[PDB]
Write a protein that binds this ligand. Structure first.
Ligand SMILES: [Ca+2]
Lengths: 97, 65
């Protein structure tokens, strides 16, 4: 269904880490990122970033990786090992994405 | 310390009213603060913090006089 409903994508998930999202919101963000990663296909490329005050890549990947069954697992582990600190800066996260 | 006798100041009702207004304003400023988890700070926090030097200075001036 996902294959037949759209075209291959270039997805960049921009997770927001901050003091506010600490607690339940962080767990919901983790689960949501994992689930939305689960909707990608081999033809799609995905990379996950995060930003409190200066943006950074959540995993070893730096540019973009094919949404294989291995790259997705690496991204899931990286997003599951995330922490919430700092003061949000959208103007840097978007300029990074 | 009395500094012997100088042009000594006397109590003025407008001065007391201004001090009271300063206290009320400080109470309002303290009541308009949001505390966020970890190190997150609302954008208005900096503007709220800028007011503290003025209030502490006016209170110190009142105490000294
Ligand atoms: Ca925030």
């Amino acid at each position: 269904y996902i294959q037949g409903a759209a075209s291959p994508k270039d997805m960049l998930i921009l997770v927001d880490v901050s003091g506010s999202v600490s607690g339940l919101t962080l767990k919901l963000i983790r689960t949501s990122v994992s689930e939305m990663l689960e909707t990608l296909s081999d033809d799609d490329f995905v990379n996950v970033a995060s930003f409190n005050s200066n943006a950074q890549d959540v995993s070893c990947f730096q540019h973009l990786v094919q949404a294989n069954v291995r790259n997705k697992k690496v991204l899931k582990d990286a997003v599951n090992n995330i922490t919430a600190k700092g003061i949000t800066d959208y103007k840097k996260g978007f300029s990074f994405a | 310390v009395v500094r012997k006798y100088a042009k000594k100041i006397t109590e003025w009702p407008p001065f007391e009213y201004m001090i009271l207004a300063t206290i009320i304003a400080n109470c309002i400023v303290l009541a308009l603060e949001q505390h966020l988890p970890d190190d997150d700070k609302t954008p208005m926090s900096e503007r709220l913090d800028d007011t503290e030097p003025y209030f502490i200075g006016i209170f110190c001036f009142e105490a000294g006089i």
